[PDB]
Symmetry: D6
C-alpha cells in the first residue's frame, strides 16, 4: 500500500480509462461530456487539456502496474469545493488499496489546492462502500432520492462530505 | 402573469436583480459582475441548452421576476430550479404561481423526471414556501456556501415528475 | 390568400405562433424558445434546403398562418408537411385552400413523390379535414409524442404526387 | 458475442458492410460512398449524440455485424434501430441476441422510452424475427423507399421501455 | 427602344430580381444556387460578388423605369461560351423591347468579352419565342427531350445558338 | 468487373487517364493539369455531391477504367455521363457493361430521371456504341468545343429512366 | 461617506479611467498591458472582458458623482491573494472618502470572493498614506528597494498586507 | 528531339526549378512573387497551386533526363494572351532542343487553351536568340528601352510576338 | 488643381468614369463592373502597394479626373501610367498638368526609374499629347487589345527618370 | 500647450500634416497615403509599443502639432524622435517647449537612455534649434534620403538621459 | 557547465523537476501538472518574452538544472529569479555558479536594473546561499504561500545591476 | 567559397553562430534565443523581403559563415550589412571575398544605392578591413549599444553603388 504512487494523467493513460469503463453500465463523462469510444475520449481530452474544473491522477505501484484512478470534478475555487471519485481496476478492488488512495486524494486536495470541502456520491445499495468512507472520515449530508438511473431504474445516492479542518487536525 | 423566454433586451433586468443579492452571479457556470460581461456570455451561450430562463411580466408588460433551470441533463432528466422575484413585487404572493408554472414546463414540455433546488438554512420562509409547493428535503449540505464572511449550510429540496402530475388522481 | 417565402422580418410572427402551442419548437431539427435563438438559427440554416416555409397573408397583407416542409429528402423525394393558422383566423375555413397550394408547390416545382404529416389522435377534426383534402392514413404511431405530461398516439397520413397530378 | 463502441479503425468494416446493399448509405443524415468521405464525416460528427453505433465481434474478435441507433431524440426519448450482419454470419441465428442487447443499452443506460425500426414489406422473415423479439407493427408506410427502380412499402415496428423492463 | 440602357447589377437591384420571379413557377437560381426569399438571394449575391461565371445587367429606360433583366451564365473563357437569358417585366413584355435587348446582350458578349458562341434554351411550347430568336439570328442546335420539369410535367426545350462571326458580319 | 467509389489513392489513375486525352481536364468545373492540383481540389470537393465517380477494376484489382456523373441536379433529376477506359483495356468489350452498370446506379439508386452525355462528331464509333446501349441523339451542338486547333461539333445523346427500367416488360 | 456606492465597471466608465490617469506620471496598465489613449484602453477592455485576474469597481455618491475607483489585481484563487489599489478623483481626495472605500474593498474581498490576504504598495515618500493604511488595519511586510521608476528616478515602495482573520474579527 | 516530352509541373520538380536559377544573376519569380531559397519557392507553389495566370511544363527525354522548362505567364483569357519563356539546362543548351520546345509550347497555347497572341522578351545583346525566335515565326513588336536591370546596368529587351493564325496555317 | 490619394468615398467617381469607356475595367488585375464589386476589391487591396491612384479636384472640390500607377515594381523601379479625365472637363487643357504632376510623384517620391503607358493607335490625339510631355514610343504591340469587336494595335510609350529631372540643366 | 495621447479621431489631423511634406509617410515602418489606409494601419498597430505619438493642442484645443517616438527599443533603451508643427503655428516659437516635454516623457516615464533624430543638412535652422535644446551631432549620413529627385545628406543628433536628468 | 536556451525537447526534464517539489507548477502564470499540459502551453507561449528559461548541462550533455526569469518587465527593468537543481547534482556546489551566470545574463544582456527572488523561511540554507551571492532581504511576506496544509511566510531578496557590475571596482 | 540562399535546414547553423556572441539575437527585428523560437519566426517571415541572408560554404560544403542584409528599404534603396564567420575559419582571410560578393548581390541584382553597417569602436581591426573593402565612416554613434554591462560607441560606415560600379 505504501508503495502506491499517484501521477498526473497523460494522453497515454486514456486507454486505461477506456478499459476501466467496461462493464460498468453507466455513461462515462469527461468534463461533463459523454463518451463511449476511445476516439471520442481522446478528442475531449485534447479539448479540455487546459480546463481547471477537473483533475485526475493515475494510481500505480512499484512495478508500475495500473492500479486505479483518482478523479476530482466540479472544482470551484470561490467556494473551494470538489467532487471526489475513485475507480480501482477489478483485479485490485479487493486488496485494500482504496483506503490509502482516499487519503492520498484528500491529501492533495487539502494540502496543495487548499480546498475547503470534499464531497462524494455513493449508491445507497452499497452500504459496505458507505461504511468504508465513514471509517475514512466522511459523513452523510444528503440522501438524494432517485438521483441516478442505474441498470434500468432510478436509484438513490448518498452524498457524504468532509472538511479541510478535520483532515488537517 | 405571463412567462416569456428571455431575450437579450431583458439582460439589464437580470443584472438589476443581481444587485441586491450581494452574491457571485453566474451564467452557464461562468462568473460575471458587469452588465457587459453578462451580455457577452449571453451571446456565447445563446445556443447552449444546458440552461433555460424565463422572465415573467404582468398583463401590461411589468417585469416581475425570473425563473431559471440550470444543470439540465437530458440523460438523467434532472435540473436545478431557482427563482428571483424583484424586491418591488416580492411579497405580493406571486412566488408559488411562478414555481408551479416552472415545474409545469419542466415536467410536461421537457419531460424531466426530477427537479431540485437549493436554499440557505437561514431563510426558513423560503424553505416552507417550497415545501408548500411539493418540494421535500433530500439533503442538508454542511458549509456548502460562503455567505457574508462565513461558511453556511444549504438545504437541497426536490420534487418528482410523478408526484407533480399524478398526486391529484 | 397569398403565400410568400419566409423572410427574416417574419421571424417575429413565427415566435408569436409558437407562443401558445405548449410544445418545444424546432428549427432544422434544433430546439429554440427565444426570438434571438431563432434569428441565429435562421441565419445558420438560411441556405439549407432540407426545409422550406411559406407565410400566407391576406389581400391586406395581414398574416394569417404558416406552412412548412421539413425532412425534405430529394433522393426518395419525400417531405413532412405542417400547417399552423393564427387563432384569429383559425375557423374561417381557409385551411383547405392552404393545404392544396402547399401540395401544389411540392408536386409542381420541387418534383416530390410523397408528402406525409402527423396529426394527434385526440383531434379527429383535423384528421377529417386532411382526409377530405386527399390524405390517407398510413400509420398509427403508438406513444410517439409527449403532450401535456402524457405520451399520446399520432396518426401519420400521406399523399402521393400521382393522386394530386393525374 | 460482444458489442463495442465504434472506433475510427472500424470505419473500414462499415464501408465493407455497405459494399453490397444497393442503397445509398448515410452518416448522420448525410450521404456518402467512399471510405474517405465516411472518415471525414465521422470526424465531423464524432461528438454528435444524435446517433450511436456498436460493433459486435466474436470471442476471437472477428467482426460479425453492426447495430445502430439514429434519430435519437432525448426530449421524446425515442430512437430508430437498425442492425446489419455480415453475409458470412447472417444465418448463424445470432440476430436475436444482438437485437436484445441493443434494446438493453437503449432502455437501461440512455433511458429511452420508445424504439422503432423500418423493415421492407417484401422481406417477411425479418418482420417475424423482429416480432418474436418484442416488436409490434405500428405503421405501413406506402411507397416510402425507392428500391431497385421501384417505390416499395415499409413496415414501421416499435417497442416500449415498459414491455422490455417490467 | 433606342432610349433603353443596360447597367451592371447592384445590390439595390436584388428587389427587382425578386419581384420578377413572382408567379413564374420555376425555381430561381443564383450562380447555380437555389433561392426563394429575398434574404437568401442577398446572401448568395454577397458570396458570389467576385465570381466570373455569370454577369447580369438591369434594363432601364430614359426615366429609369425598371424594364427587365439580361443574364449571362455558364460563362467559360476557354471554350468562349455563355448561356443567355432575358426577363422582361410583365408590364413591358408586349412593347417590343425584347429584340433590342437581345442585340444589346449579343453586342456585349461578342464585342467586349469576345466570346465565340452564345446559346439559349426555349420551351418547345412557346413557338412565338422561338421564331423571335430566329428572326434575331439564332438557330436550333438541339431538341432536349424532357429536360425541364415545368408546371408539374417534364417538357422539352429547344437549344438555339449563334456564333460571333455572323453577328460581327 | 466490379465498380468502387473513387478513393484518394485512385487519383493517380485519373491523372494517367488524362495524359492521352490531350484535353483540358476538370474537377467539379475547375481546371487542373498536375497531380497535385487534382489532389487538392479532391480534398476541397470531397463532400460536394454535384459529381460522383466510380473506378472499375478486374476481379484481382486490375484498374480498368472510370465512370463519371457530373452536373447532378436532384431537383430536375438529371446528370451528365462520361466514361474513360484505359488504353490497355480499351478494345476488350468492357465499355457497354460499364455503361449499363452506370445507368443502373443512376436510375435505381439516385432515382434520376434523365442521363445525357456528349461525344465528338469525329468519333462515330462512340456514337454507335452509346446508341446500341439505349442513348438517342437530342442535339448537334455546332462548334461547341475547340479540339486540336479547330472548333468542332458535339453530339448530345440521352436516355430516360422509364425506358431503361420498363422497356423489357 | 455612508452614501457612497460601489458598482461593477462598465464600458461607459472607461472615460473616467482615462481622466484619472491624467497628470499622474506613471504608465497605466490594464491586465498587465500598457496603454495611454482612450482607444487602446477600450480595446484591452474588450479583450479581457472575461478575465478573472482583476476586478474593478467605480465609486459614486448619492447623486452619482464619480468619486474614485477600486482595483483588485493579481488575483490568485489557489493562494487566495490580490493586490489592492484605490484612486480618488482630485476633487474628492481631501474629503475623507478613502477610509470608507478601503473598508468597502476589504469587505468585498474577504466576504464574497473569500480571499486570504490583501496586499498593497505605497511610495515610501508618502508617509501620510502609509499611516492611513496602518490605521485601517494594514501593516508593513516589505520595503522594496528601487522597485518603481517614478518621475525620473528609482524609488522604494512599502508592501503592506492584512489577512482575512483580523478583518472578520 | 522527337523523343522529348512535356509534363505538368509537380511539387517534386521544384528542386529542378531551383537548380536552373543558379548562376543566372536575375531575381526569380513565382506568380510575380520573388524567391531565392527552395523553401520560399515551395511555399509560393502551395499558395498558387490553384491560380490560372501561369502554367509550367517540365521537359524530359526518353530516359527522363530533365532537359528544361516551359513557362507561360501573364495569361489573360479575355484578351487571350500569354508571355512565353523557356529555360534549358546548361548541359542541354547547345543540342538544338530549343526549336522543338518552342513549337511544343506554341502547340499547347494555340491548340488547347486557344490563345490569340504569344509574346516574349529577349535581351537585345543576344541577337542569336532573337534570330532563333524569328526563324521559329516570331517577329519584333517593341524595343523596350532600359526595361530590365541585368548584371548591374539597365538594358533594353526586344518584345516579339506571334498570332494563332500563322501557327495554325 | 490639387491631387489627393483616393479614398473609399471616391469609388463612385471611378465607376462613373468607367461608364463611358465601354472597356473591361480592372482593380489590381481583377475585373469588375458593378460599384459593389469595386468597393469589395478596394477593401481587399487597401494595403496592396502594387498600384496607387490619385483623384484630382478643383480648388473648391470639383473632382476632375484620375491618375493611376499600376504594375509598380520596386526592384526594376518601373510602373504603368494611365489617366482618365471626366468627359465634363475633358478638353479644358488639364491633361498635361496632371501628367507632369504624376511623373513628378513617380520620379521624386517613389524614386522610380521608368514610366511607360499604353494608348490605342486609333487615337493619335493622345499619342501626340504624351509625346509633347516627354514620352517616346518603344513598341507597337500588334493586335494587343480587342476593342469593339476587333483586335487592334497598341502603342507603348515611355519616359525615364533621368530625362524628366535633368533635361533642363 | 498640452500633449495628449493620439486617438483615432486625430488620424484626420495626421493625414493633413502629411498633406504638404513631399515625402512618403509611414506608420510603424509601413507606407500609406490615404486616410483609409492609415486608419486600418492604426487599428492594426494600436497595441504595438514600438512607437508612441502625442498630439499637442492649445488651451482652446486647437491642434498645433505632433510629436512621435519610433524605433523604440526597450533593450538598448533608445528611440528616434520626430516633431511636426502645423504651418499655421510654425514660427510661433513653440517648437522648443514641445521638444523638451517629449524628452521628458522619454526619460521620466519610459526610462530610456538615448534619443536620436534625423534632420536634413540643407535646413541648418532646425539643426541649431535642436542643438540649443540639448542635442549634439553624432553622424553625417551621406546620401541617406532621396528628397526632390536627389539624394541628400542627413545629420543624426542624439541626447542622453544623463544630460537631461542630473 | 554550459547554459542553453530551453528547447521543446527539454520539457520532460522540467516535468521531472516538478515531481519532487510537490507544489503547483506554473508556465507563464498558468497552472499545469501533466507533461502534455506543459507541452501545449509551451507551444502557446513560445513567442512570449515575459519569461525566459535556460537549461544547464555538463560538458558532455548531462542536464544538471534550470534557471528561470519570470515577471520580466522591460519598462521597470525587473524580473523574478528562480533556480532548481536536480536532486542528483543538488549538493555538488553548482548552485552559486548558475546564479552568477544567471545574474550576468540579466544585467549584461537584457540590461535589467533589479532582480528579486522568493524563498521559504523554513529553508535557511537557501537564504544564506543567495545572501552569499549578493542578494539582500527586502521583504518578509507573512502567510504568502500555502505549503503542506499551512500558510507560511516567504522572504523576498533582491540584487541590483549597479552592485553586481561595479562592486569590485 | 560559394554563397547560397538560407534554407530551413541551415537554421541550426544560425543558432550555433549565435551560441557565443554575448548579445541578443534578432530575426526581422524580433528577439529569440532557442532554435524553436527561431524556426517559428523564420516560417513567419519566410516571405518578408525586408531581410535576406546567404550561407557561405566551402567547396566541400563545410559551412564557413553567414552574410545578412537587414532594414532593406526599396524606396530609398538602402540596407544594413552584417557578416559573421565561424570561429573555426575566422582568421583564414576569407572575410574580404565575402564582403565583396555581398555588395555585388546588393548592387547588381537588387539594385540598391547605399549599404551601411555598424562596427564596435573597440575593434579597430574590423574597421580597417571594412575600410580596405571600400567602406568609409559616416557616423560615430555615442553609447548606441549595451555590451558587457556598459554602453559603447559604434561606428557606422557606408558604401554607395557608384563606387562599386563605375
Amino acid at each position: 500500500n505504501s508503495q502506491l504512487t499517484l501521477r498526473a494523467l497523460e494522453r497515454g493513460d486514456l486507454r486505461f480509462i477506456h478499459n476501466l469503463n467496461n462493464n460498468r453500465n453507466i455513461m462515462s463523462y469527461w468534463f461533463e461530456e459523454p463518451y463511449e469510444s476511445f476516439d471520442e475520449l481522446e478528442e475531449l481530452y485534447n479539448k479540455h487539456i487546459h480546463d481547471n474544473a477537473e483533475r485526475r491522477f493515475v494510481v500505480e505501484d512499484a512495478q508500475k502496474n495500473l492500479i486505479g484512478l483518482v478523479e476530482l470534478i466540479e472544482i470551484n475555487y470561490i467556494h473551494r469545493s470538489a467532487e471526489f471519485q475513485i475507480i480501482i481496476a477489478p483485479e485490485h478492488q479487493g486488496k485494500g488499496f482504496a483506503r490509502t488512495l482516499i487519503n492520498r486524494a484528500l491529501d492533495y486536495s487539502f494540502t496543495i489546492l487548499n480546498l475547503h470541502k470534499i464531497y462524494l456520491h455513493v449508491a445507497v445499495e452499497n452500504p459496505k462502500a458507505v461504511h468504508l468512507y465513514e471509517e475514512c472520515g466522511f459523513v452523510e449530508e444528503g440522501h438524494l432520492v432517485e438521483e441516478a438511473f442505474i441498470n434500468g431504474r432510478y436509484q438513490d445516492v448518498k452524498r457524504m462530505y468532509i472538511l479541510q479542518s478535520k483532515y488537517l487536525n
